[PDB]
Amino acid sequence: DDIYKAAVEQLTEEQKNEFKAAFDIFVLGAEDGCISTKELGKVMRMLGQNPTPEELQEMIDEVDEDGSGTVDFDEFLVMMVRCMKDDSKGKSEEELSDLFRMFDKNADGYIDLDELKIMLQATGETITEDDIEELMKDGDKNNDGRIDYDEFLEFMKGVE
Template sequence: MAENKQSAEAIVSDVHKKIRAAFEAFDFESNNTVDAREISTIVYSLGCFPFQKDLHDFISQVEENHSGYVHLDKFLPAMTKVLMEHKFPPIPEDLLLQAFEVLDKEKKGYLEPEELTKYMTQEGEPFTQEEMDEMLTALADHEKNHIYYKDLISQLTIDPDM
């Protein structure tokens, strides 16, 4: 019994480390606070892909009195609950690969940033240009200006046993 408790504590500890690392990447003033507009990127980086309505509800829950800022003390328990309860489940790797392959009509193995921007800002639940800029900065091969999606799938998904 104690073994199970210890492993549960270890899992929560690992989850906290991942959340803190993702949060701290956007804590530019090192004051345990991030701009609320960065929360979507942080949530996505943790392998969660909520619908926009669910994401906005989550941001409202963790934002400090409509100040435009989110403090780690409020974000950490809320995001831990999301991850532990699998509230915003990750997209399976095979499904993500199929989606990229549908977009890659010429079967090149990559997408041009302009192509991805067009799809992501005009289809489904559209991303904002700011979200796309952040995504392209993180995902594009800057030498060739291509997005090699097969290399990215492991970055865009998360181990379901986490």
């Protein structure tokens, strides 16, 4: 899914530099993409995180959505961010709040399905009912039908 290239955007570059520096090691001799999934535990143990075999096996299943035991740099960066939210910096909560006043053109203190809709129309991106409600519930943590401001932060922190 799109969170792959999202992370490729979301991730910072000083990260991916040492990401490749450590990525250089997996080759057990003469490899060109034959990476295995039993080594997923070890490679998640390498890059600086502290993983546990439970999540190791889950990501063995949760990742390898291609099933080939392989992971793209896109998939690499996403399964970085989809667990460790090394996303596009989540610019702030308060720069976010000034963005949120423009979300609530109606000065709501909450992004409602209406404000969600109008703001995504201001993107030009059309309103499918899932879209806004996918955004609503992903932001409307209280499930009040609308995304209040901290709902918006936890919503759009780690977000460009």
